[PDB]
Write a protein that binds this ligand. Sequence first.
Ligand code: HEM
Ligand code: HEM
Ligand SMILES: CCOC(=O)N1CCC(Nc2cc(C)ccn2)CC1
Ligand SMILES: CCOC(=O)N1CCC(Nc2cc(C)ccn2)CC1
Ligand SMILES: C[C@H](O)[C@H](O)[C@H]1CNc2nc(N)[nH]c(=O)c2N1N=O
Ligand SMILES: C[C@H](O)[C@H](O)[C@H]1CNc2nc(N)[nH]c(=O)c2N1N=O
Lengths: 412, 412
Amino acid sequence: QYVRIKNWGSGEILHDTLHHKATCLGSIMNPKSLTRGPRDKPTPLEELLPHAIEFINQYYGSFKEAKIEEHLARLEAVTKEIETTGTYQLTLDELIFATKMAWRNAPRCIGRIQWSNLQVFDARNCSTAQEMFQHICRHILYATNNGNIRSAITVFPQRSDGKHDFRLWNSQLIRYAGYQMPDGTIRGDAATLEFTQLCIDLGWKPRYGRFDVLPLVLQADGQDPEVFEIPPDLVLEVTMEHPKYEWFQELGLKWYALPAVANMLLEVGGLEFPACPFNGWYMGTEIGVRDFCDTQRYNILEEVGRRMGLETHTLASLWKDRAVTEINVAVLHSFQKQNVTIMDHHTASESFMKHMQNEYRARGGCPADWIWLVPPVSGSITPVFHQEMLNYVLSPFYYYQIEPWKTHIWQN
Amino acid sequence: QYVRIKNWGSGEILHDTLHHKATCLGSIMNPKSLTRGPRDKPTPLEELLPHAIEFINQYYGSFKEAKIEEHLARLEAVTKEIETTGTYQLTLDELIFATKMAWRNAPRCIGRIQWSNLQVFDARNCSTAQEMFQHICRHILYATNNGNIRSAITVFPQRSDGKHDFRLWNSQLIRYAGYQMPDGTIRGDAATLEFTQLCIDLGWKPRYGRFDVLPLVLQADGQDPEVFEIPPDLVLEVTMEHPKYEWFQELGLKWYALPAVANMLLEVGGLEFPACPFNGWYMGTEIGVRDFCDTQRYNILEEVGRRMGLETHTLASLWKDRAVTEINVAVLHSFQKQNVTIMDHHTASESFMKHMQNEYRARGGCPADWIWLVPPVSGSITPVFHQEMLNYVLSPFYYYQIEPWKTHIWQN
Ligand code: HEM
Ligand code: HEM
Ligand SMILES: CCOC(=O)N1CCC(Nc2cc(C)ccn2)CC1
Ligand SMILES: CCOC(=O)N1CCC(Nc2cc(C)ccn2)CC1
Ligand SMILES: C[C@H](O)[C@H](O)[C@H]1CNc2nc(N)[nH]c(=O)c2N1N=O
Ligand SMILES: C[C@H](O)[C@H](O)[C@H]1CNc2nc(N)[nH]c(=O)c2N1N=O
């Protein structure tokens, strides 16, 4: 009937029924269950129609006051379109509803309380890489909003036969380059070494800097990817300063204000959109902990430790715990001072708890991935840590995809 | 053939084959798969014998230089014993091997690098509650070792028909009481309110203190549980002090030095031991973060915040991150100063990584529960966070049990 869920902090119990509408490798980053790969043929009609009907029923079923006639008419119209064209086009309202539901159904997102607040850019009529670039620049500009970050998503043309896929090769819209310097050292973001090289191979000019914004590698209509530099005026950045440590600024650190996922696929009513970049606003720890403190990234932990005069040669001293916190304080302080939207992990965590509570009352469940929802620092200090969660895949959904460079058949 | 596992920090890859020897509710605390319940009849022979043979093969297969004749003789002897008695007794060496393997197979234990270092107390001949108490006191004394903590396990009589089970009703050997005071406030450990009341119902005298060591509630031969106060001389405690904050001592905090799990069941070769308390040594965060900072426990976070002069009314200030770290420092500092064994979470985490590496080479796998292995603070700062893990149940294994008070048929 339902799955019992308990919060070991408040003792509160919840009943999950939503998992029934779903379609031990728990700590796996990219499991097949969260990946929707490529195709070389259109979706079989026997599979498409049922999914299409289901979504249309879900859409019309979401209205406060039902509109039965429109519901029947749409069901009929969709079927006919599938029979006559082999697929169908979602109405703008349906697409908007789908993008919000997919966000609402994202198990790895802690910011889901904001799910109903999403700007949707319909770029389904797009046809060239240049046009993609223009849509993306428009998105970046709208979302950035001079620091007052706004959530948005740009929907490109849906997959037809799988041979004409629109794809953004970048993992994120804004990301820094990584360079393997002559002296053997690594400059910039060590995690983008391979992708940076790819950009260089495609004609992009390497600037050998610590924070060089990578260009957009855009694939349109299944054709070879084209490189486009993002106009610097569109990239808002925050310079890192500490409210007490004047020497923090001497580290010369900065980060971009816009967190935008660029390579995921939107699945809805049998349709697949291989290109649908979206963004929200940053949670402090993403920058302060992952970007700055992961060893395979900027790895600034030890340097910050020394400057604080900490016993960096004795792990038991907990110097790492002290350093990471000052870096997190720097990130939040800098964004706030520069009037750029950002949320700390404690506030975000409480926000998600409220959302989860809302979801269980509204639809009897909330797909959630504990491993991703608990922040990279102060785990049990946040309420999410004490909350039992059920991880399942619904529809609409935002899936991962196989890296484009691994399945792309080059034309030259 | 094997399951591919990746460390997203070092990029290292590992192949898991051990999961084949195994017998999404990932964040569930007490799932049925980790619980081994009660019975009212002996284990069916058709089930027992196969498991017994398997274990005997595993035991003899662990020797560097094989002893084929002894192996065959033991296999024959065990079968005959099962046919003539309906069960069998493990040799002391087999039991020792089983306890270490079960520890080695504990997915939720970060201290497994120490798996081969375990003192085993054979109490299989025990028959009364008084005798249980004496064995437990002996265990506590040996393990405590005047601060130089030693890992040990006491094995009580195996389950026969399930009606004569030896059980320790306590979750841990040493634990503090919780009292619902007259003024409505809670004194002591809020998490032991119900169990404390049970002890009181059984005749134990409540001392209404903040740190009152709970008595042992012992069940022997399936009979009603008897209460036994632990002699204070056997309970080593550490008074909490901060290396810089003289006011920390004013909080009047302390904690016991001995971490001992008391209510789990040891499964091995078809046999079940409902009573087998074991202990290792503490990892700082257990006390500093869970015991002291969980809201449903001692909840000292805000008080420590104020005393540090922090902005405790502004979450974004990250005051909680600053407070929890000073508490962790206090715990480690206090244990070290009082010469009581303890390990910080960073060192423990690195220790487990080394162990995992050792296990994959030795037997092609290491069952691990990411959700429990990643410390309650500084998650991504530890290497375990970046390690993909596979969680599976092998044999021998340490299982949870249904709370005794829920299935016990009282004789009076
Ligand atoms: C409004 C503010 C938002 C906040 C603060 C927020 C925060 C986060 C954070 C912290 C993550 C983890 C990122 C990582 O560790 O890689 C995440 C993941 C995710 N978010 Fe949100 N989010 C927001 C908006 C959105 C929006 C607008 C969408 C979609 C329309 C969305 C979709 C997702 C998805 C699908 C993931 C998983 C990405 C992956 O698996 O790599 N989020 N979000
Ligand atoms: C030598 C030092 C040891 C250290 C530092 C260590 C540390 C830990 C820690 C931190 C936990 C988590 C406790 C919790 O969150 O509830 C744990 C769990 C566990 N440990 Fe170890 N351990 C050690 C020795 C042992 C020994 C000697 C055994 C068994 C013979 C063992 C068996 C287990 C088991 C089965 C669990 C899971 C308990 C549960 O699920 O509640 N550990 N250990
Ligand atoms: C390692 C580079 O990471 C990133 O560029 N990002 C981290 C991952 C991802 N974060 C996000 C995404 C969204 C949509 C909202 C808040 N936070 C996008 C930004
Ligand atoms: C909430 C009370 O918790 C406890 O008494 N403990 C916490 C849970 C458990 N910890 C342990 C156990 C072992 C065997 C080794 C290290 N640490 C036993 C002690
Ligand atoms: C191995 C493990 O799955 C991986 O390190 C995880 C852990 N948690 C997590 N949370 C978020 N929000 N983002 C992430 O990328 C990860 N993963 N790690 O990097
Ligand atoms: C809900 C979740 O499973 C629970 O809060 C967990 C999380 N992790 C964890 N690790 C250890 N080592 N011990 C634990 O008890 C827990 N759980 N929580 O208390």
